[PDB]
Design a protein around this motif. Structure first.
Motif, mmCIF file in Angstrom:
data_model
loop_
_atom_site.group_PDB
_atom_site.id
_atom_site.type_symbol
_atom_site.label_atom_id
_atom_site.label_comp_id
_atom_site.label_asym_id
_atom_site.label_seq_id
_atom_site.Cartn_x
_atom_site.Cartn_y
_atom_site.Cartn_z
ATOM 1 N N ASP B 44 36.805 2.147 -55.244
ATOM 2 C CA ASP B 44 37.656 3.292 -54.930
ATOM 3 C C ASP B 44 36.849 4.581 -55.084
ATOM 4 N N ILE B 45 35.998 4.813 -54.087
ATOM 5 C CA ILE B 45 35.023 5.893 -54.169
ATOM 6 C C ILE B 45 35.575 7.206 -53.623
ATOM 7 N N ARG B 46 36.593 7.156 -52.761
ATOM 8 C CA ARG B 46 37.142 8.353 -52.139
ATOM 9 C C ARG B 46 37.951 9.206 -53.102
ATOM 10 N N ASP B 47 38.356 8.660 -54.241
ATOM 11 C CA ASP B 47 39.306 9.318 -55.119
ATOM 12 C C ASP B 47 38.770 9.381 -56.543
ATOM 13 N N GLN B 48 37.525 9.828 -56.677
ATOM 14 C CA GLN B 48 36.965 10.122 -57.980
ATOM 15 C C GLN B 48 37.193 11.585 -58.333
ATOM 16 N N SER B 49 37.085 11.893 -59.621
ATOM 17 C CA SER B 49 37.098 13.270 -60.083
ATOM 18 C C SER B 49 35.751 13.891 -59.758
ATOM 19 N N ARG B 50 35.774 15.085 -59.180
ATOM 20 C CA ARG B 50 34.567 15.771 -58.757
ATOM 21 C C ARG B 50 34.590 17.202 -59.268
ATOM 22 N N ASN B 51 33.399 17.763 -59.480
ATOM 23 C CA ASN B 51 33.298 19.111 -60.023
ATOM 24 C C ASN B 51 33.308 20.177 -58.941
ATOM 25 N N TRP B 52 32.986 19.818 -57.705
ATOM 26 C CA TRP B 52 32.785 20.792 -56.647
ATOM 27 C C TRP B 52 33.576 20.382 -55.416
ATOM 28 N N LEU B 53 33.683 21.301 -54.471
ATOM 29 C CA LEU B 53 34.427 21.075 -53.245
ATOM 30 C C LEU B 53 33.776 21.884 -52.132
ATOM 31 N N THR C 81 46.212 14.813 -52.137
ATOM 32 C CA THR C 81 45.478 16.006 -51.748
ATOM 33 C C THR C 81 44.005 15.643 -51.650
ATOM 34 N N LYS C 82 43.409 15.888 -50.487
ATOM 35 C CA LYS C 82 42.107 15.328 -50.170
ATOM 36 C C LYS C 82 41.342 16.271 -49.256
ATOM 37 N N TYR C 83 40.018 16.171 -49.301
ATOM 38 C CA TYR C 83 39.157 16.932 -48.407
ATOM 39 C C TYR C 83 38.448 15.974 -47.464
ATOM 40 N N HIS C 84 37.926 16.514 -46.372
ATOM 41 C CA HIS C 84 37.425 15.720 -45.263
ATOM 42 C C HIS C 84 35.973 16.102 -45.013
ATOM 43 N N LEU C 85 35.058 15.177 -45.284
ATOM 44 C CA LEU C 85 33.633 15.489 -45.305
ATOM 45 C C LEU C 85 32.896 14.397 -44.546
ATOM 46 N N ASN C 86 32.316 14.773 -43.396
ATOM 47 C CA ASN C 86 31.554 13.891 -42.499
ATOM 48 C C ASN C 86 32.428 12.742 -41.989
ATOM 49 N N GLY C 87 33.700 13.041 -41.774
ATOM 50 C CA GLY C 87 34.594 12.072 -41.195
ATOM 51 C C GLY C 87 35.281 11.149 -42.169
ATOM 52 N N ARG C 88 34.951 11.205 -43.453
ATOM 53 C CA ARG C 88 35.645 10.397 -44.438
ATOM 54 C C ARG C 88 36.409 11.296 -45.401
ATOM 55 N N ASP C 89 37.538 10.786 -45.881
ATOM 56 C CA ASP C 89 38.434 11.531 -46.749
ATOM 57 C C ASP C 89 38.149 11.162 -48.197
ATOM 58 N N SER C 90 37.961 12.169 -49.035
ATOM 59 C CA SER C 90 37.751 11.963 -50.456
ATOM 60 C C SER C 90 38.871 12.632 -51.231
ATOM 61 N N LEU C 91 39.360 11.931 -52.248
ATOM 62 C CA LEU C 91 40.403 12.430 -53.130
ATOM 63 C C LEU C 91 39.933 13.668 -53.881
ATOM 64 N N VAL C 92 40.715 14.741 -53.803
ATOM 65 C CA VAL C 92 40.432 15.931 -54.597
ATOM 66 C C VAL C 92 40.881 15.645 -56.028
ATOM 67 N N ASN C 93 39.919 15.503 -56.927
ATOM 68 C CA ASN C 93 40.163 15.029 -58.277
ATOM 69 C C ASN C 93 39.101 15.611 -59.198
ATOM 70 N N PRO C 94 39.469 16.488 -60.143
ATOM 71 C CA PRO C 94 40.802 17.068 -60.305
ATOM 72 C C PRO C 94 41.001 18.324 -59.457
ATOM 73 N N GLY C 95 39.916 18.868 -58.921
ATOM 74 C CA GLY C 95 40.002 20.009 -58.045
ATOM 75 C C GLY C 95 39.937 21.327 -58.777
#
Lengths: 517, 207, 104, 207, 207
Positions: B44-53, C81-95
């Motif tokens: 489940d790589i799409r829904d990790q906690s990340r520091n940046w956006l 709630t998610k962002y879209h980067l190079n055609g794949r969607d990643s979960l915004v966590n924690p944002g």
């Protein structure tokens, strides 16, 4: 430091000596007893809106504020400032309290008698370490008057705290102001402190003679292409062929540009002419507002946007503009004739109009059967490549505001206009010392509720040094400047009338000279 | 960049943080709502906690180099991305630095989000796509959004037992704390510098 | 912070600035449109002029700890709630740093 | 030292600078005339319990007491004291009286009038050699208030002596307090003394 | 500079010592509150001749004038001047204000009571750079009296400006006099300045 000896003189002057101007004011004040020497928990009433619930405290302390430009500048000194300078900022200030007279007042059944009380003190301290709540910079009444002959009343100090409705939270801080070291002043004594302003930018007191989209040579084309056409009439079928063009002065709207306008947050548009406005109650429902801890607060005036566009001057936004009152205007529900609505028409070059959209962005991916649809941008944050101007400052507007001590802040210019200061000029708090009446000849452990009724008066001097920024324009034609009209009238502007009432007829902004982008 | 912004972690180790992974559970056959949480790894790589956006966007319409995929209409100004300044509309060209396309989709430049250079001996008006040299911003797919797609999606309501969660896509996104981005590429026949306009405020004064 | 961003003023003193407080007036029974302006104090506290405004947002769907208030559907990726980067969607966590809930 | 000249300032602060804390208070007081300037033999009434018989004297003198911890510590300063320290003790004190105003009050048949009396004095001494009966440390009312904005009334000094019921003993000592050297203070004058606490143990502020 | 201390003496003399004469005068003045501390626009009434239309301002400020020869010369000193000299001119002057008493006056329903107000000031400045309208030299009443025992009233300062009838012109200047630096004087304080006359010709005091 005696009874019959003056402890200070009247300094009310302005000296222009180059890249600096020092503005000195002096006013006479009157300080009454506030809350009858008590601290009182204040809050909103139980029957009230959720947006209007507050919790705080009122103090016996008064405070001096000089956070208006007319406190230091006369209209002739403001006119010297704005027609000759591309910028200004404060450098240092000097504060004085002197010639303090504590008058005791006795109501004996028919007639008020007022006598001197020579051995009575007045407590003055400054909150120079910023450990009281900072109530200045919120555009409150009770500053120094615009006119030096006027005597003002010192406003009562009070702060708000955290609330859950009209109740209190465990994190609500109570502040006793007799827990600070204060200087006690009889007649003969005086108070003085100095303050150095931090390195703040110059306030941009110019307009722009170029708009952001008109920043190129009209005579030369660009070497870049843009998509100019999508379909071509191949006979009568009109097939899709992408076609590209270089943009010149003829196709000027669609050139490649390096920059884009500053952020917006759309406001509803209200007309000065009352027949164009909508016949409904939209002053809160059609209002632009933010939502903080479950309550809605009016965005007023908000981020610096233009109030209207070209040839459309009868439209201020709704609450995106400082609205000053005329002299003798009552506080509630006045008509538009009793107020002075300001204007941000000089920042049409870089800022968006407050009543229009930012632009339009695509919302889908067009195909052979799906077409391109665009939605307009009403709220736009900050993009890389944005440039913008801050809000104009006015002669009766605020000078500074305290930047809130937080982890993050972007571009800390106050939204009411002025100088954002992490360490602003400190609060100067003032209070009559309680002089009790005669105690009972037997001991009572209860506190005193009976005090001698008294007030204090005296003079106050503020001396601010301002740094100027001179203009270096190579402009040939003459410039727009603030002038008085020579046409005759019953009263001269910025002058007392036959009753001795000083009035300011219009808000004077500071953006009259020009500068290229 | 040899790494994208979402692929900035160790695939071999899980995170110690949870995310809401499931909303309902099949309790028999009624399917009641039970919030369930998981740690995110490489599966489940799409829904990790990340520091940046990713950096800011401002959506452009998408145009094909192959002329048969484009729409048969006049959308070069009506479908154009534009800003509104003193009552007149100006074409956003090229605008903020966004990627021109995503993976395996190179035949799509945006519309006016790309510097378009002319070939030698190209006349000034209404030339075909063979006479021009459309550039490309495919190296900044790691931190910048694609210019022809949305930023992401945000919720628009507050879901209840009878109201469901609805999301609207973000086509215009300003600057948030935590954004990192790359500027636009420079070219051998592109500009070197630009003058920053003398104004009170400017954010990130790259041309 | 012991103060919120909207509650940053003296409640005791009014502002010298006006805001558009009313749009129409009951001129008899026709209710014509007349713009009216007021100074804001502690009574009309929601609509004062302010120098600052809150930080950025990026809305999230709201989930309850009490399992009966949550919606009985699979929304852990569709309502995400998610962002879209190079055609794949990643979960915004924690944002970006936002408050998890409001009062009470 | 004049009429229109302040003889002291408001010091009400607390400074924490390591192994020391200095707590400064300032209060406003009011001193009336006690016993109408008389010394009076006081005793218990003749109808009373044997446990409740006393004999002593009331004086015209008032006394200052600050033998409460709220006289010097705020609740926030008390919270700093108790969550961070295994012990505390006093080291020295500094006392001041200043800005003294003697008001003359005249009852003329309808209305109390209060005026200044500039040439009137106030007698202050300290009993630094412990040759008066020590009435402090008996948990009496009339100390400095907990809150700095409150004005307090100075309590009347009185002592008890030996009794045989409500009567006196031959060893009963009478103390005239105008038989001490006192400092006389008009407006303009001030009073000050210092005191060094002896080596007392730390109060055990732990469980 | 105290309450019960004189800040100046009575100098009223004339000394003839050759080619010079120094004339010293001293007068007692009384300054009331003018316009009840207000600035007021004054003008001619609407029904008036065109020759008599004026526009100006009255101030709360009083002014001292000594622009009469009897202010400085007695008749015996004037007779010494005119029977012995072919000419005269002024050289320098010295001005003083001293022994200033601010009296507070209370009307309580039957009888005026007047008391001292010791902590009240009086603002004095000189317009030594000639940037107020000069109303002296227009033969107005309210100078120093001819006779040294007379007490005079300080006249109210007022100036006229440009008018178009009884109305104002855009070039009409308003002058706030609290926008000048003034010296504030309690009892005990005094005011003094000196002035040097420019090289003026002798007034021809011959036939």
């Amino acid at each position: 430091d005696g009874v019959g000896n003056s402890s200070g003189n009247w300094h009310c002057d302005s000296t222009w000596m180059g890249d600096r101007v020092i503005t000195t004011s002096t006013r006479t004040w009157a300080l009454p007893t506030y809350n009858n020497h008590l601290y009182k928990q204040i809050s909103s009433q139980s029957g009230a809106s959720n947006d209007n619930h507050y919790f705080g405290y009122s103090t016996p302390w008064g405070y001096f504020d000089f956070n208006r430009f007319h406190c230091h500048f006369s209209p002739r000194d403001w006119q010297r400032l704005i027609n000759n300078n591309w910028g200004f900022r404060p450098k240092r200030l000097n504060f004085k309290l002197f010639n303090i007279q504590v008058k005791e007042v006795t109501q004996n059944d028919g007639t008020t008698t007022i006598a001197n009380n020579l051995t009575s003190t007045v407590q003055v301290f400054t909150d120079s370490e910023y450990q009281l709540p900072y109530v200045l910079g919120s555009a409150h009444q009770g500053c120094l008057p615009p006119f030096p002959a006027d005597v003002f009343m010192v406003p009562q100090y009070g702060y708000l705290t955290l609330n859950n409705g009209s109740q209190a939270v465990g994190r609500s801080s109570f502040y006793c102001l007799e827990y600070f070291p204060s200087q006690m002043l009889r007649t003969g004594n005086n108070f003085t402190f100095s303050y150095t302003f931090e390195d703040v930018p110059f306030h941009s007191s110019y307009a722009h003679s170029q708009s952001l989209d008109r920043l190129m040579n009209p005579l030369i084309d660009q070497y870049l292409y843009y998509l100019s056409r999508t379909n071509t009439p191949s006979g009568t079928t009109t097939q899709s062929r992408l076609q590209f063009s270089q943009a010149g002065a003829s196709d000027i709207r669609d050139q490649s540009r390096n920059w884009l306008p500053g952020p917006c947050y759309r406001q509803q548009r209200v007309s000065k002419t009352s027949a164009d406005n909508n016949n409904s109650e939209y002053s809160w429902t059609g209002a632009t507002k933010y939502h903080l801890n479950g309550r809605d607060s009016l965005v007023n005036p908000g981020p610096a946007m233009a109030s209207h566009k070209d040839d459309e001057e009868k439209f201020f936004p709704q609450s995106g503009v400082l609205i000053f009152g005329k002299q003798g205007s009552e506080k509630t529900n006045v008509d538009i004739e009793k107020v002075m609505i300001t204007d941000e028409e000089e920042i049409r070059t870089t800022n968006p109009v407050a009543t229009e959209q930012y632009g339009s962005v695509s919302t889908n991916l067009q195909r052979g059967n799906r077409q391109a649809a665009t939605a307009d941008v009403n709220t736009q944050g900050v993009l890389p490549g944005m440039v913008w101007q801050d809000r104009d400052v006015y002669l009766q507007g605020p000078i500074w505001a305290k930047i809130p001590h937080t982890d993050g802040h972007f571009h800390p210019s106050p939204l009411m206009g002025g100088f954002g200061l992490k360490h602003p000029p400190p609060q100067i708090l003032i209070k009559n010392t309680p002089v009790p009446a005669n105690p009972s000849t037997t001991f009572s452990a209860a506190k005193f509720a009976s005090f001698i009724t008294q007030y204090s008066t005296g003079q106050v001097s503020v001396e601010i040094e301002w740094e100027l920024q001179k203009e270096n324009s190579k402009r040939w034609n003459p410039e727009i400047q603030y002038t008085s009209n020579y046409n005759k009238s019953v009263n001269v502007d910025f002058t007392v009338d036959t009753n001795g009432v000083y009035s300011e007829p219009r808000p004077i902004g500071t953006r009259y000279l020009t500068r290229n982008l």
